[PDB]
Amino acid sequence: AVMHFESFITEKKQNIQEHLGFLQKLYAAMHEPDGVAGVSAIRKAEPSLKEQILEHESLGLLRDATACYDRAIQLEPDQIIHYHGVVKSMLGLGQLSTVITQVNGVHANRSEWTDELNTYRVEAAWKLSQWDLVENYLAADGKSTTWSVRLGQLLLSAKKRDITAFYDSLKLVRAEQIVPLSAASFERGSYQRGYEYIVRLHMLCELEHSIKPLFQVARLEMTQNSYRAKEPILALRRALLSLNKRPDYNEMVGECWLQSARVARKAGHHQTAYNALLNAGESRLAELYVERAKWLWSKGDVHQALIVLQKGVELCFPENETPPEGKNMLIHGRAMLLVGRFMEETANFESNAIMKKYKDVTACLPEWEDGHFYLAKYYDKLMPMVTDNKMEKQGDLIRYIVLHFGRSLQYGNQFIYQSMPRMLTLWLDYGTKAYEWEKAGRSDRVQMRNDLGKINKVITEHTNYLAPYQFLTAFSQLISRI
Amino acid sequence: AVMHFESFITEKKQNIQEHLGFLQKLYAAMHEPDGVAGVSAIRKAEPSLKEQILEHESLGLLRDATACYDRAIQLEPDQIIHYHGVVKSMLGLGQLSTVITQVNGVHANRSEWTDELNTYRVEAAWKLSQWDLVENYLAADGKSTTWSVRLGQLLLSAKKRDITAFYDSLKLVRAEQIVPLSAASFERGSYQRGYEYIVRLHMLCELEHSIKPLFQVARLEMTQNSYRAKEPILALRRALLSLNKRPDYNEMVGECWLQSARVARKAGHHQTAYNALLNAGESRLAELYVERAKWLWSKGDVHQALIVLQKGVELCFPENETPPEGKNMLIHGRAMLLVGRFMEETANFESNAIMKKYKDVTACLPEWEDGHFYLAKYYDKLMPMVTDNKMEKQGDLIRYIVLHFGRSLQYGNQFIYQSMPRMLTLWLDYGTKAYEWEKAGRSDRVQMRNDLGKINKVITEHTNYLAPYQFLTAFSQLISRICHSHDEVFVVLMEIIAKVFLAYPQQAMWMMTAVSKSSYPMRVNRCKEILNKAIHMKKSLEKFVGDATRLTDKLLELCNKPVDGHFKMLKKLVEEATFSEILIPLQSVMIPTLPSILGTHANHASHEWAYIAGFDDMVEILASLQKPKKISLKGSDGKFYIMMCKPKDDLRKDCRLMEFNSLINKCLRKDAESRRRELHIRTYAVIPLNDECGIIEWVNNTAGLRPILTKLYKEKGVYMTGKELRQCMLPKSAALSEKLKVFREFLLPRHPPIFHEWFLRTFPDPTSWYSSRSAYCRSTAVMSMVGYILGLGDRHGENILFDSLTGECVHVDFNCLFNKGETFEVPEIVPFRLTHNMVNGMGPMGTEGLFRRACEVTMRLMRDQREPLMSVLKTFLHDPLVEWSKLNETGEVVNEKAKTHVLDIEQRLQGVIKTRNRVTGLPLSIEGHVHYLIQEATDENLLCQMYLGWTPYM
């Protein structure tokens, strides 16, 4: 189509806003969401039912989704699609038990069909503890099939064990879901298009390597291991992550209710980036009391992403709930009790908390851990913020007191990386060309030559701490300053 | 309960976060939402479903509502409230035709009932085009005890006309709104709690006064004309505004369907302010395509509101769907099809559309319009950007180009005004001095006098056009630079202020007085000229001209008698008591203060109030180591008004603040976050007479803080050793660490909770106690912040009075201004007085209760209106008849630190504090900026370094 479509527009140039609204559909069902946003860049009517729905499924926004679908019901009866995208948007905010109330309000009209029972009411308590409807709304069972739907029967067959029929039900659908990625396989990101179904595939082995120890032994391929190598679009990764939660509820003690909440965090860990922001509104709220420190920690990251940093900062002092004032012997709980004390260093932004405070606290944190990447890289950069507006640039004692902490941090690190060993080798040569003009026309070399030697003690350490593989990036710059 | 709650903390300290969870109930049903957030700001678990719901349903931020509900279902059954609260938010985001489905889900489930049929599912198509379920969902009908539900009975019956039940079900429900407001009407401004049911009154009547043609000929009580009457809160308005959508389709062609959009337009008109931002997503779409120019305008306003100003500007060129380039003759569209052409005002401050295009595209529009009050008022402000951006400040022909569009603009206008007549006269008079700086020693005198002479011509033109009514607003500032030594400037100012003083001179009798009688003779010799050419056309007015002088001559001798060793009118003020045939108005802080006008009624200018009519009996005379004097005046209508002679310093300072607070109080009136809290600064007029002094409007029912700090505190004993109480209080070189200790060792003498108990022991119980505290916070926090942004200092224990009845806060002694309290001997670095005693009045969990939330609205409405507030204070910074007490001939120079002080309010109302050193800019948020400046009170680190005559220990 689009081969011949925009070829048509170049010869006999019947310009586009006449021939316009068809062209969305070409971009639409291809799922080429970049193009659909390009449509409204040129459209000079912005008029209609379909088109103003059709852009919104490409916008990625899901706040005002329900409004646009409400406008269809203002103008139309059922016509499945419109109601069908309502509950999507309800699931866009993840609104399970309300969708359970939204269930029968189609079938007190039986509004042309059963299909929305057959799609998300088939679901809703899929993503919830309940199964009762999900058992029973699976009644048509052939006019039901979607990604979730036969997938629905898996956990019903996990709540009704049926060892042959369970393994049948994997081998029922697992191949059938590859048929969409079994398209004409061109290496132009053949993997890339791909990826939703690949992740959809990636679900299913994480059933098998997890359900077996409840079912008859395979312990490993734990429910978070492979996660750390995934694409954080998170319009995509959520399709893991809720379904990643409940096998720990389909499993048991071992404290189910810890990790169910702990996975429900990581919804928000990648809802703060890649926004779709309003469904963070349950990312906080998909928890009860488990591990308040990390839970209130990411609750700051709504605020740090959204607007108000003080409501971040203030709500980063029911940090003080999580254990205050000694008693600290909680090393793993410590290991992110202190990470929250690095995102009290938000309010470098919100100034007038005093200079020395963060200079206390984010120096009170490298008391603790001394590997553990997150310590000093901030505690570096806050200092040369000040050394700018300090004395410039002869008495620079804190050259020394900084360049521990690129090094002696990256000692323990490898990761928040690329900026720093520039600055380490920069401040070593920000060091320099004061000196030859202290050598030429000054005599304030008194401490500074010695302080260079103080710096020179620090280099030799970490150039024998750090493997030179991790010197390799700014190694080019080392060739510069021969 | 609340009366007996904070009392329960003071004695018998059940500590707060222990007993805290009960207390949020007490704000909840009482619709006292500002309690809840601060109370939740002390609780450390945020534990329940319901309390977080109670947090949520108080604040009413409705976008994230269903998340609170969805977990609440996931622990619970029906328990009606939760599902009952779901559909609130559903109608809260107006998701109506989805609620229609969301009705019928509970029929099959029966989550304990199907009673929520009767609650909201009654409505759903109460807005929407159906009514047929509404026919059917009327099934319980004794279980219909709800506002809209019984209201829902009407339009079913109103289409099937039902002449009997038409009026009768009104006077059913007409009573059924009043029975709650028929609570016993305690007159503390009860009207405002109030207001929803009064809105609910105004709901009904536009049905009744418009069904009449189809009910059986008129259709009056015009729905859009009555629409200007109410608050733009929109959390209260929209229920009317939805109802104003409703009978539009009942009436018909005549283009019904204009209004269905245009009320949906005026839905989303008031939704940019007072957010409910995503609910405006429906406002954008609860519409038709009617008048797409006026529609495509509106969508960018959310984007001027929400985040991105680009997209609206990008959406401002499908504006050119609606016709550019021909087809221009669309006069009724040209009412608003050009308004959007202004509303690339948005595009002004996302830079880089080039300068002259904005100079084009704006200044196109009066040449499209010429009336149209907003005409150059935006085009105004681009020009003084360019002036400092040009040569500073010699060759400024744009001054001439500006002030047309100051002036000739405003003959069209009435309203968006207050910012300009400053700048009219300011950049007139800020022209002026540089011309004598050419007449000092420069060479462009041949140009610039004629250029000023051109500028001088621009003035007198529009003053003949404009009524003096608009000049009355800036009238003190018009007085403020009479000491032009310049050529025609004063000569125009003669014919300015004459034509001002020709009308409404009675208020302006007073303001001549303080400059007419100052030592400062260059004023005074010039002052009596200013009378004369005005006197030249007064003839009837000229007695009161003589009389007011002859008043104030005796009123000097008020403050020039008190050498006396309690004395009388009848002893010495017999001259005053001799009083025949003089009517002069009694200073009436309401009525020198100038309500402006909307609505194209040119001009009529009116105020709404009395003359002297004798005096009181005698003068009670305070000592205060100064001998001031309680003098009443008895008024025309028997209302005794009580005045103070004062033997102190200048009051011309304090004059302008009484302008200024009222100007704020105007804007505090116009927005109603303030009015839901009912806050105002108590103004009271101070009319100076000399640079010695003039007169204070005393307020009765009043007592200072230190005498309140005596009384019950005496009953528990006042530590009265004085300088022995101030033993270790050395100068600065003594350690604040030590000064902590002497404070902390003698904190334990000074007990807090009396301020709660004063607020008990002199007060009756039932509820009059309560709103008195809702005064007491919301009083103090405003003039806290207003005092902060005006940097006032030295709020003494005798500087702050309170009503015996309402307990509103009262601020006197406005001498210790901007950073004079930081220029001071012991420099006050405390931003405003709020000691621990000031806390414990609005006591335990008043601590940061309403007061924070009150303080939010202040700064918000401050940082809303920067510039229409701002440069009043520039005139106040550049009023040269002001202190610097310090005599000479060439008086009234300049507050030389003004240009510094110009900054010293700008960043504070940019939300940028002093640039705590070696750090950047980064403006705070408002709800940010408050909490920092709150702890600036309880900075005992700072507070022990405070001057002790100010009594921070108190």
Round to whole Å and give the CA distance between B497 and B763: 50
Taking the CA of residue B285 and the nearest CA in chain A, the distance in Å comes to 7
Determine the length of chain A: 482
Taking the CA of residue A64 and the nearest CA in chain B, the distance in Å comes to 6
- Determine which of A351, A357, A388 to mutate to test the interface with B (most B C-beta atoms within 10 Å): A351
- At residue B86, the 3 state secondary structure works out as helix
Residues 6+ apart with CB under 8 A from B608: B591
Nearest CB neighbour to B281, from listed A64, A128, A352: A64
Tokens representing A122 are 């088939």
Cβ contacts (< 8 Å) between A308 and chain B: which residues?
925, 927-928
Nearest-Cα residue of chain B relative to residue A293: B45
Round to whole Å and give the CA distance between B454 and B433: 16
Short-list B297, B284, B390, CA closest to B345 = B297
Decide: B778 and B678 in contact? Cβ < 8 Å: yes
Round to whole Å and give the CA distance between B754 and B954: 11
- At residue B801, the 3 state secondary structure works out as strand
DSSP label of B923: P
DSSP label of B631: E
B169-172: long-range pairs with CB below 8 Å, 24+:
B170/B204, B170/B208
Round to whole Å and give the CA distance between B886 and B900: 20
B916–A70 C-beta distance less than 8 A: no
Give the pairing type, strands B642-645 and B629-632: antiparallel
Cβ contacts (< 8 Å) between A314 and chain B: which residues?
41, 931
Tokens representing B536 are 């030249």
Decide: B159 and B180 in contact? Cβ < 8 Å: no
Tokens representing B904 are 């010293």
Decide: B529 and B494 in contact? Cβ < 8 Å: yes
Describe the crossing of helices A420-441 and A445-465 by its angle, rounded to 10 degrees.
Answer: 150
- φ and ψ at B686, to 5 degrees? -120, 110
A101–B102 C-beta distance less than 8 A: yes
Torsion B419-B424-B427-B432 (CA) sign: negative
Give the containing element (helix H, strand E) for B570: helix B569-572
- At residue B802, the 3 state secondary structure works out as strand
Round to whole Å and give the CA distance between A473 and A466: 13
Round to whole Å and give the CA distance between A305 and A299: 10
Can you say whether residue B378 is alpha, beta or left, with left for phi > 0 and alpha for psi between -120 and 50 degrees? Answer: alpha
Give the containing element (helix H, strand E) for B544: helix B542-560
Round to whole Å and give the CA distance between B680 and B665: 6
From edge to edge, which strands make up the β-sheet containing B694-697? Answer: B567-568, B618-621, B629-632, B642-645, B694-697, B686-688
Round to whole Å and give the CA distance between A476 and B861: 55
Strand partners, B585: B611
Q: How many CB atoms lie within 10 A of CB A114?
A: 17
Round to whole Å and give the CA distance between B924 and A351: 8
Residues 6+ apart with CB under 8 A from A58: A27, A28, A33, A36, A37
Determine the length of chain B: 954
- φ and ψ at B751, to 5 degrees? -95, 140
Round to whole Å and give the CA distance between B353 and B21: 55
Taking the CA of residue A467 and the nearest CA in chain B, the distance in Å comes to 36
Short-list B701, B842, B711, B871, CA closest to B784 = B842
Tokens representing B531 are 């009378």
Cβ contacts (< 8 Å) between B918 and chain A: which residues?
355, 385-386, 388-390
A63–B278 C-beta distance less than 8 A: yes
Decide: B748 and B822 in contact? Cβ < 8 Å: no
Decide: B552 and B514 in contact? Cβ < 8 Å: no
Taking the CA of residue A355 and the nearest CA in chain B, the distance in Å comes to 8
Torsion B73-B78-B80-B83 (CA) sign: positive
Describe the crossing of helices B521-535 and B489-502 by its angle, rounded to 10 degrees.
Answer: 50
**Amino acid sitting at position A26:** L
Decide: B444 and B438 in contact? Cβ < 8 Å: yes
Round to whole Å and give the CA distance between A189 and A55: 25
Taking the CA of residue B664 and the nearest CA in chain A, the distance in Å comes to 26
Cβ contacts (< 8 Å) between A352 and chain B: which residues?
913, 916, 932
Give the containing element (helix H, strand E) for B366: helix B366-369
How many CA atoms does the CB half-sphere of B163 hold within 13 Å? 5
**Amino acid sitting at position B276:** A
* Residue B158, Cβ density class (10 Å: 0-12 exposed, 13-18 middle, ≥19 buried): buried
Decide: B296 and B321 in contact? Cβ < 8 Å: yes
Nearest CB neighbour to A70, from listed B71, B97, B105: B97
Q: What angle do CA B800, B805, B809 make, to 5 degrees?
A: 25
Tokens representing B150 are 């019984």
> Tokens 């809209």 correspond to what residue?
B148
- φ and ψ at B630, to 5 degrees? -80, 105
Nearest CB neighbour to B74, from listed A97, A320, A352: A97
- First-to-last C-alpha distance (Å) of chain A: 59
- φ and ψ at B810, to 5 degrees? -135, 130
Round to whole Å and give the CA distance between B346 and B303: 9
Tokens representing A411 are 């000692």
CA distances, B164 to each of B154, B158, B160, B205 (Å): 11, 11, 11, 17
- At residue A227, the 3 state secondary structure works out as helix
A108–B916 C-beta distance less than 8 A: no
Cβ contacts (< 8 Å) between B285 and chain A: which residues?
67-68, 70-71
Taking the CA of residue A301 and the nearest CA in chain B, the distance in Å comes to 16
Decide: A403 and A385 in contact? Cβ < 8 Å: no
B913–A352 C-beta distance less than 8 A: yes
Round to whole Å and give the CA distance between A473 and B632: 85
Round to whole Å and give the CA distance between A300 and A239: 25
CA distances, B309 to each of B26, B281, B304, B342 (Å): 42, 17, 5, 14
Tokens representing B11 are 């004695």
Describe the crossing of helices B49-59 and B16-28 by its angle, rounded to 10 degrees.
Answer: 50
Decide: B231 and B675 in contact? Cβ < 8 Å: yes
Q: What angle do CA A297, A299, A302 make, to 5 degrees?
A: 125
Round to whole Å and give the CA distance between B167 and B761: 51
Strand partners, B619: B567
Torsion B258-B260-B263-B265 (CA) sign: negative
Decide: B932 and B911 in contact? Cβ < 8 Å: no
Tokens representing A25 are 């559909």
- At residue B511, the 3 state secondary structure works out as helix
Round to whole Å and give the CA distance between B668 and B785: 13
B69–A98 C-beta distance less than 8 A: yes
Residues 6+ apart with CB under 8 A from B563: none
DSSP label of B803: B
Cβ contacts (< 8 Å) between B105 and chain A: which residues?
100-105, 108
Residues 6+ apart with CB under 8 A from B892: B483, B520, B522, B523, B880, B881
Strand partners, B800: B811
Tokens representing A237 are 């990764």
Residues 6+ apart with CB under 8 A from A118: A137, A140, A143, A144, A146, A149
- At residue B250, the 3 state secondary structure works out as coil
DSSP for B670-712, written as a single string = HSSHHHHHT-------EEE-SSS-EEEE--SSB--HHHHHHHH
Nearest-Cα residue of chain A relative to residue B927: A310
Decide: B633 and B615 in contact? Cβ < 8 Å: yes
Q: How many CB atoms lie within 10 A of CB A183?
A: 11
B108–A108 C-beta distance less than 8 A: yes
- Determine which of B101, B279, B306, B788 to mutate to test the interface with A (most A C-beta atoms within 10 Å): B101
Decide: B911 and B929 in contact? Cβ < 8 Å: yes
- At residue B772, the 3 state secondary structure works out as helix
B617-622: long-range pairs with CB below 8 Å, 24+:
B617/B568, B617/B569, B617/B570, B618/B566, B618/B567, B618/B568, B618/B569, B618/B570, B619/B566, B619/B567, B619/B568, B619/B569, B619/B573, B620/B566, B621/B562, B621/B564, B621/B566, B621/B567
Tokens representing B96 are 């109506």
Taking the CA of residue B101 and the nearest CA in chain A, the distance in Å comes to 4
Taking the CA of residue B643 and the nearest CA in chain A, the distance in Å comes to 44
CA distances, B646 to each of B516, B561, B565, B634, B690 (Å): 18, 11, 17, 19, 10
Short-list B360, B286, B376, B361, CA closest to B319 = B361
Nearest-Cα residue of chain B relative to residue A100: B105
> Tokens 């193009």 correspond to what residue?
A35
Q: How many CB atoms lie within 10 A of CB B107?
A: 13
DSSP for B182-246, written as a single string = TS----SSGGGTTHHHHHHHHHHHHHHHHHHHHH-----S-TTTGGGGS-TTSTTTHHHHHHHHG
Nearest CB neighbour to A104, from listed B108, B128, B919: B108
Short-list B556, B763, B634, B549, CA closest to B7 = B763
Round to whole Å and give the CA distance between B368 and B356: 18
For chain A, what is the radius of gyration of the CA atoms?
Answer: 29
Tokens representing A52 are 């103003």
B321–A281 C-beta distance less than 8 A: no
Q: How many CB atoms lie within 10 A of CB B778?
A: 27
Tokens representing B332 are 């009724």
Round to whole Å and give the CA distance between B954 and A235: 59
Taking the CA of residue A319 and the nearest CA in chain B, the distance in Å comes to 10
Short-list B641, B652, B341, B715, CA closest to B518 = B652
Tokens representing B261 are 């959009």
Torsion A92-A97-A98-A102 (CA) sign: positive
Decide: A271 and A151 in contact? Cβ < 8 Å: no
Tokens representing B778 are 């919301």
Round to whole Å and give the CA distance between A428 and A433: 10
* Residue B465, Cβ density class (10 Å: 0-12 exposed, 13-18 middle, ≥19 buried): exposed
Round to whole Å and give the CA distance between A425 and A429: 6
Nearest CB neighbour to A104, from listed B66, B104, B321: B104
**Taking CB atoms and an 8 Å cut-off, how many pairs form between chains A and B?**
148
Torsion B390-B394-B396-B399 (CA) sign: positive
Residues 6+ apart with CB under 8 A from B743: B940, B943, B944, B953
- At residue B641, the 3 state secondary structure works out as coil
**Amino acid sitting at position B489:** V
Nearest-Cα residue of chain A relative to residue B100: A105
Tokens representing B478 are 């018009």
How many CA atoms does the CB half-sphere of A257 hold within 13 Å? 4
**Amino acid sitting at position A404:** H
Nearest CB neighbour to B44, from listed A94, A307, A318: A318
Round to whole Å and give the CA distance between B407 and B420: 9
Tokens representing B289 are 């395509």
> Tokens 């414990």 correspond to what residue?
B840
Q: Assign 3-class secondary structure to B440-479.
A: HHCCCHHHHHHHHHHHHHHHHHHHHHCCHHHHCCCHHHHH
Give the containing element (helix H, strand E) for B807: none
A285–B918 C-beta distance less than 8 A: no
- At residue A60, the 3 state secondary structure works out as coil
Tokens representing A143 are 């006019």
Torsion B214-B216-B219-B224 (CA) sign: negative
A105–B102 C-beta distance less than 8 A: yes
- Determine which of A90, A97, A106, A242 to mutate to test the interface with B (most B C-beta atoms within 10 Å): A97
Resolution of the experimental model in angstroms, please? 4.7
For chain B, what is the radius of gyration of the CA atoms?
Answer: 31
